[PDB]
Amino acid sequence: HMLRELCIQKAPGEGLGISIRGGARGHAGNPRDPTDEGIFISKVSPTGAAGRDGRLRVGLRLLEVNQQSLLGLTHGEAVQLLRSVGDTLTVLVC
């Protein structure tokens, strides 16, 4: 699980084209051990930017988007980061 930063081309108004899961847990979780709150890629759309680039896969841990930590962000805020404008988007994964 080597930490790596990927810069992925996309159309300037397009999102990265991945689905994510994880993040802060609720009342089934364990606040004494918050290390199971990572964000992971759960889908890669074949025609989206991540799919076209070919590198990202389901199961990767996603630590940052555009240099910003996902830790503690809500799902919706992480999705919004993945929809940031620009002709590239950067992810930090392992």
Author numbering: -1 to 0, 1098 to 1189
Original paper wording:
A defining structural characteristic of SCRIB includes the presence of four clustered PDZ domains in the C-terminal portion of the polypeptide. Herein, we employed a combination of biophysical, biochemical and cell-based approaches to acquire structural insights into the α1D-AR:PDZ protein complex. Without significant expression of necessary PDZ proteins, α1D-ARs are retained intracellularly and produce weak functional responses, suggesting this protein:protein interaction site has the potential for pharmacological modulation.
Our model identified D571α1D-AR:R1110PDZ4 of the carboxylate binding loop and T570α1D-AR:H1170PDZ4 of α-helix B as possible α1D-CT PDZ ligand interaction sites within SCRIB PDZ4. SCRIB PDZ domain sequence alignment revealed that R1110, but not H1170, is unique to PDZ4, suggesting that this residue may be responsible for the specificity of α1D-AR to PDZ4. In support of our structural prediction, purified PDZ4 harboring either R1110G or H1170A mutations ablates α1D-CT binding. However, the structural role of R1110 is unknown. We predict this shift creates steric hindrance that prevents the interaction between I572α1D-AR and PDZ4. Previous studies have found PDZ ligand:PDZ domain interactions are dictated by interactions of the C-terminal residue of the PDZ ligand. Finally, we demonstrate that SCRIB R1110PDZ4 serves as a unique α1D-CT interface site that could be targeted to modulate α1D-AR pharmacodynamics. Thus, targeting SCRIB PDZ4 may provide the highest opportunity to disrupt α1D-AR function without perturbing other SCRIB complexes.
